[PDB]
Amino acid sequence: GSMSDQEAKPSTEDLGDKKEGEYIKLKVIGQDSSEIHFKVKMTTHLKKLKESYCQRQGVPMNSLRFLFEGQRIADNHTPKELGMEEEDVIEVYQEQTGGHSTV
Amino acid sequence: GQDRFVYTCNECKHHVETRWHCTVCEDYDLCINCYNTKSHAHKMVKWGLGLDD
Ligand SMILES: [Zn+2]
Numbered sequence: 001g002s003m004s005d006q007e008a009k010p011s012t013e014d015l016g017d018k019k020e021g022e023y024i025k026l027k028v029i030g031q032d033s034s035e036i037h038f039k040v041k042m043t044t045h046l047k048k049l050k051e052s053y054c055q056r057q058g059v060p061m062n063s064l065r066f067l068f069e070g071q072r073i074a075d076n077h078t079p080k081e082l083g084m085e086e087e088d089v090i091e092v093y094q095e096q097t098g099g100h101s102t103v
Numbered sequence: 104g105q106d107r108f109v110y111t112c113n114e115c116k117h118h119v120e121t122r123w124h125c126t127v128c129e130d131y132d133l134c135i136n137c138y139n140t141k142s143h144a145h146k147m148v149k150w151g152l153g154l155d156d
């Protein structure tokens with residue numbers, strides 16, 4: 001009936017209450033200087049993630065690239081590999097800003 | 104043992120080349136989608152009975 005056999009939980013270690021299951025922590029950090037920290041639901045091709053970032057900034061179909069691990073993957077699949085738990089990190093490379101700078 | 108995946112999933116009604124049957128919950132079947140999204144571990148036993156290929 002009690003929370004713990006010993007007596008009571010410290011509650012200090014456990015702060016807040018989040019599922020941290022359905023949603024995951026996916027972020028990107030280009031060489032140029034990008035820092036984005038947000039969580040996205042894991043139930044659709046990773047496309048529904050980079051698509052927002054890419055469209056609201058730039059499309060990978062040129063300079064920007066999305067490296068899931070150590071290679072390139074299509075944006076038309078979800079069960080191919082993904083299968084992330086929470087700490088999802090994707091590396092990207094930006095050859096050019098695509099604006100302002102001449103190159 | 105290991106066999107085919109000839110089964111179905113009652114969470115989304117979309118069987119997928121794979122089926123895990125959770126014992127503890129019994130009569131509980133999950134596919135690659137619900138399992139990955141829900142995150143339901145519980146020592147599941149892969150049940151199949153078709154042709155693997
Ligand atoms: Zn399902």
Ligand SMILES: [Zn+2]
Nearest residue numbers: 125127128145
């Ligand atoms: Zn279970």
